[PDB]
Design an enzyme around this catalytic site. Structure first.
Site, PDB file in Angstrom:
ATOM      1  N   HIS B  41       0.898  -1.618   0.042  1.00 46.67           N
ATOM      2  CA  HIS B  41       0.279   0.455  -0.048  1.00 46.67           C
ATOM      3  C   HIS B  41       0.666   1.119   0.023  1.00 46.67           C
ATOM      4  O   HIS B  41      -0.035   2.499   0.541  1.00 46.67           O
ATOM      5  CB  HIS B  41      -0.864  -0.183   1.075  1.00 46.67           C
ATOM      6  CG  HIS B  41       0.461  -0.009   2.407  1.00 46.67           C
ATOM      7  ND1 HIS B  41      -0.061   1.539   3.115  1.00 46.67           N
ATOM      8  CD2 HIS B  41      -0.666  -1.392   3.067  1.00 46.67           C
ATOM      9  CE1 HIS B  41       0.402   0.853   4.413  1.00 46.67           C
ATOM     10  NE2 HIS B  41      -0.099  -0.008   4.521  1.00 46.67           N
ATOM     11  N   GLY B 143       3.584   5.906   9.819  1.00 47.85           N
ATOM     12  CA  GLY B 143       5.165   5.771   9.633  1.00 47.85           C
ATOM     13  C   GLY B 143       5.891   4.516  10.113  1.00 47.85           C
ATOM     14  O   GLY B 143       7.347   3.856   9.758  1.00 47.85           O
ATOM     15  N   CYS B 145       4.571   1.260   9.382  1.00 47.50           N
ATOM     16  CA  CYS B 145       4.483   0.544   8.377  1.00 47.50           C
ATOM     17  C   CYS B 145       5.344  -0.519   8.002  1.00 47.50           C
ATOM     18  O   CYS B 145       5.992   0.892   7.402  1.00 47.50           O
ATOM     19  CB  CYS B 145       3.460   1.193   7.373  1.00 47.50           C
ATOM     20  SG  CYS B 145       2.028   1.212   8.460  1.00 47.50           S
TER      21      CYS B 145
HETATM   22  O1  Y0O Z   1       0.274   4.876   4.918  1.00 47.65           O
HETATM   23  C1  Y0O Z   1      -0.009   6.017   4.471  1.00 47.65           C
HETATM   24  O2  Y0O Z   1       0.322   7.728   4.590  1.00 47.65           O
HETATM   25  C2  Y0O Z   1      -1.367   5.495   3.513  1.00 47.65           C
HETATM   26  C3  Y0O Z   1      -1.354   6.845   2.317  1.00 47.65           C
HETATM   27  N1  Y0O Z   1      -2.369   7.052   2.053  1.00 47.65           N
HETATM   28  C4  Y0O Z   1      -3.082   5.297   1.409  1.00 47.65           C
HETATM   29  C5  Y0O Z   1      -2.944   4.997   2.202  1.00 47.65           C
HETATM   30  C6  Y0O Z   1      -3.221   3.565   2.355  1.00 47.65           C
HETATM   31  C7  Y0O Z   1      -4.152   1.970   1.862  1.00 47.65           C
HETATM   32  C8  Y0O Z   1      -4.823   0.799   1.934  1.00 47.65           C
HETATM   33  C9  Y0O Z   1      -5.034  -0.031   2.574  1.00 47.65           C
HETATM   34  C10 Y0O Z   1      -3.672   0.201   3.461  1.00 47.65           C
HETATM   35  C11 Y0O Z   1      -4.115  -1.049   4.780  1.00 47.65           C
HETATM   36  C12 Y0O Z   1      -4.786   0.041   6.195  1.00 47.65           C
HETATM   37  C13 Y0O Z   1      -5.640   1.212   5.049  1.00 47.65           C
HETATM   38  C14 Y0O Z   1      -5.892   0.739   3.744  1.00 47.65           C
HETATM   39  C15 Y0O Z   1      -2.215   4.199   3.376  1.00 47.65           C
END
Ligand code: Y0O
Ligand code: MG
EC number: 3.4.19.12
Lengths: 301, 300
Positions: B41, B143, B145
């Site tokens: 993601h 942050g 992830c």
């Molecule tokens: O990490 C970030 O900053 C971030 C910024 N824009 C979009 C996303 C996304 C996405 C798809 C799923 C991923 C897992 C749970 C949320 C939804 C993440």
């Protein structure tokens, strides 16, 4: 979200652990530039531990009686001397992984990470606090001596503890890196005991703020109190006295959550007087006191 | 003596943490050999969170849309591919600090260390267990992830977890390093709720044996139990069923302490019925379930 007992990343310190052997005794050393630091009791035999004369036992020793092993390499000792209860072995080679570092002495109530090691080999890392009675509730087995405690502040490792001995109640005692003991202990086999411990009040308050930040609010109430009033309650329950300095330190958490410290002390007053009534706080049935205010802020923000 | 939630020394994993950026999104990547592994993601924008079509998002990317930063140095991406829910970025430099490693998918109840990271710089290390409902009770801020979970056997790092998201109850969900989620979760913002969590019974038993080893016996009793009767009781307190596999796993700790497994089970039944009446066990006033049989042997 979430709140865990968290240690500093240990890589910078892993790069400094060596094995030090003197006779039969093998323990851990700390290798920074061209010096290896370890407990001076590495020079003692079983007969010596009962009443060692360290200056005498050392003068009879010489460089070549110290086998220093860094991983697979042998380091050769080119000098030896004592500073307080720490033995300083000058070696022929600087450690290429020496991190930026300082020796600091911590105050009871402050926290640090411990890299536990066996035969110069790091086996685990955990977080602990210097107790008010100057012990630490560590997890150590035979051969852990010379394992070290540390904080990291900005690529700089601040070394604050070196493990020396276990006390009969299962807790541990050691020195700063300048060889000064924390607490009234000596490096000798005699009868030693930890003094009666107390709870680190400012740390419990910090952890309550952590719980509020993490959505745990049931212990908050409408009341406030005063430093004098609360400190009477603290004394009664073997909590350390809360000082004005403590209140100022907590200042940020009091702002960031809208609960003032004496406001929070009122909650703690109530928790001490009435218990938790089956509820928990951050997954604990006990009031947790090994997180500093700084620990909470760094982990929570 | 003593008993601590103890993590593995984190140095071998610290040397593999990098920062991956795509668009405005930055998170952590794991750099091993010439591949950077991160959550896929990283390629989502705000509009993509609810129903991302990862294949469609990815096909619009070229290598140079991915910025990888290892400390101060930019790594050059020369290829990319998606495997399940991880992105694998080929880079032009093999990581000189790559440890001996393997990828392992763990089972619920297994423990591991987490190196929490932000912007590819490690922040802290702590010890976790895979809950029976396939979540972990971590400590992760925005942050984090791409932070990873691992065990170290001798000098081999076994990577077992990559962090992807926080569920609404404050627990965390992630994948193995092949990008398969643990549990029924998806890298999608939808209503998905963790199953009701249970206590890891075999771990509690192992930790009760730990307490005996460190010299504490107050909680034993003179009773035994059959396995089925123990499971009938324990599931009323939301404990995981104990299987014969679990009984076998505990065999060694039984022999070291001289307490048969079903006798320790009888002690656990009484603990659940009585609480601890103001006592503690290895310093806890709750039954601890994030130490495995293997962990207990290692620390004791
Ligand atoms: O990490 C970030 O900053 C971030 C910024 N824009 C979009 C996303 C996304 C996405 C798809 C799923 C991923 C897992 C749970 C949320 C939804 C993440
Ligand atoms: Mg109040």
């Amino acid at each position: 979200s979430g709140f865990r007992k968290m240690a500093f990343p240990s890589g910078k310190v892993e790069g400094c652990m060596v094995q030090v052997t003197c006779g039969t005794t093998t323990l851990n050393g700390l290798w920074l530039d061209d010096v290896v630091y370890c407990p001076r009791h590495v020079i003692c035999t079983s007969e010596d531990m009962l009443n060692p004369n360290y200056e005498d036992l050392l003068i009879r020793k010489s460089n070549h009686n110290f086998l220093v092993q860094a991983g697979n390499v042998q380091l050769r000792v080119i000098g030896h001397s004592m500073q307080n209860c720490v033995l300083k072995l000058k070696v022929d080679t600087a450690n290429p992984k020496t991190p930026k570092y300082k020796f600091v002495r911590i105050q009871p109530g402050q926290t640090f990470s411990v890299l536990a090691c066996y035969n110069g080999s790091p086996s685990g890392v955990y977080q602990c606090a210097m107790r008010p009675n100057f012990t630490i509730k560590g997890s150590f087995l035979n051969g852990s001596c010379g394992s070290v405690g540390f904080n990291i502040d900005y690529d700089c490792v601040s070394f604050c503890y070196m493990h020396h001995m276990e006390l009969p109640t299962g807790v541990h005692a050691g020195t700063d890196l300048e060889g000064n003991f924390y607490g009234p202990f000596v490096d000798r086999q005699t009868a030693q005991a930890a003094g009666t411990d107390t709870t680190i009040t400012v740390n419990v308050l910090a952890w309550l703020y952590a719980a509020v930040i993490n959505g745990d609010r049931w212990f908050l109430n409408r009341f406030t109190t005063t430093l004098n009033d609360f400190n009477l309650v603290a004394m009664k329950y073997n909590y350390e006295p809360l000082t004005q300095d403590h209140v100022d330190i907590l200042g940020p958490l009091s702002a960031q959550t809208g609960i003032a410290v004496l406001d929070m002390c009122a909650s703690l007053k109530e928790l001490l007087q009435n218990g938790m009534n089956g509820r928990t706080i951050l997954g604990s049935a006990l009031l947790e006191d090994e997180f500093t205010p700084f620990d909470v802020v760094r982990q929570c923000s």
